[PDB]
User: Which sequence fits this backbone?
């Protein structure tokens, strides 16, 4: 784990 993500972003979708 150096430049790895473990994050999730959610918004609005139709």
Assistant:
């Amino acid at each position: 784990g150096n430049h790895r993500s473990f994050s999730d972003k959610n918004g609005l979708t139709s």
Summary: Residues 5 and 12 are 22 Å apart (CA to CA). The chain is about 0% helix and 0% strand. The radius of gyration is 12 Å.
